[PDB]
Amino acid sequence: ADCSSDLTSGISTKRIYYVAPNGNSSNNGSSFNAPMSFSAAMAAVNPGELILLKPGTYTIPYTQGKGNTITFNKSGKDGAPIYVAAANCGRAVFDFSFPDSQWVQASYGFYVTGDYWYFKGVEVTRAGYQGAYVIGSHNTFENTAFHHNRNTGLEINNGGSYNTVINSDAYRNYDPKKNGSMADGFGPKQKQGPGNRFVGCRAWENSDDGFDLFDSPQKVVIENSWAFRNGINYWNDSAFAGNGNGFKLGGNQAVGNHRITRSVAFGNVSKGFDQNNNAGGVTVINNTSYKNGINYGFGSNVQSGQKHYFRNNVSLSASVTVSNADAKSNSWDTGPAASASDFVSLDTSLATVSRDNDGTLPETSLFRLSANSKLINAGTKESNISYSGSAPDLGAFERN
Ligand SMILES: [Ca+2]
Ligand SMILES: [Ca+2]
User: Fold this and answer.
1) Residue 77 appears among annotated catalytic residues
2) Nearest ligand for residue 244 CA
3) Smallest Cα–Cα separation from 308: which of 345, 280, 276, 266?
4) Does 208 appear as a known binding residue?
């Protein structure tokens, strides 16, 4: 929807701190006519209150060989988060100013160590390392973006738990450190805690992977999300080493029983949906994968007692290998066959059309089912999968 008429962008708060790029100490933040600085607002803000950002660019100065990270160590409370949002559903871009060739170890853009933060309509770009690095818990990132950073767009690690990433984008992240073999779009990986979730997100044109859940035994849930064109060299790097997977759903033989539904992967150099040596069974229901190096790659061993669960998935214009799995009602087994005519559009340029100003993904014809497709009502009635008609349609999109 269009929330441009709402000053606080959908947020209910008891106190507003008005902030602008030119905000300073001669102001109290009582309105946009007397805006305070971001740092001043950060010092004053308490649980349940809101740092309201005037739409624009907030530039953090760069100094060669030095980090310029903003640390979010204060905490909100349950039912009283600390809100940080661009006004009138606009955009607030935090530019950390790092030159393309430069990077600093641990120089994140946003370092979130505290709990119960709620970000909306904010972007992080040109950070010296990860755009956002989250070790705190119960944080929310809604209608945010992390792009052109020197490492992974947004990463959750070192105990970070119960974090929710809603309608957010991560793109064009590349690490000069390892020639692109590290920077992902979203990285809920390694030592992250439980309960981390991604819904309505898009990750594209990152040097390494779209989403990466490497070496974590903690279950991650990914819903209604996109991962495309990862692993492509847009940086003129003669030694490029990006892997190029869409959803990298595991790693290092960690047992991670992840769940991914109604999601889309296309145009990735390697695998659209990737087991990546996860030793645990992954749940993959109602997804669509198109023209990747490999559409679904689950051809590695799992630990005894583990088994993947695949239902209602679509593969088109690339191969599928799904072993060690309970699989049926997919386009490559007992479900109906998928071909180009089953889709209204395969124009991939539609994938990055603008979201609504409230964050809602654009409604386009890309990968939507044609009216005469046999994929309609052809799926199994899996628990917690929404549908119209008699049964779920095969793939990520219900024909409505
Ligand atoms: Ca990666
Ligand atoms: Ca249906």
Assistant:
1) no
2) 1
3) 280
4) yes
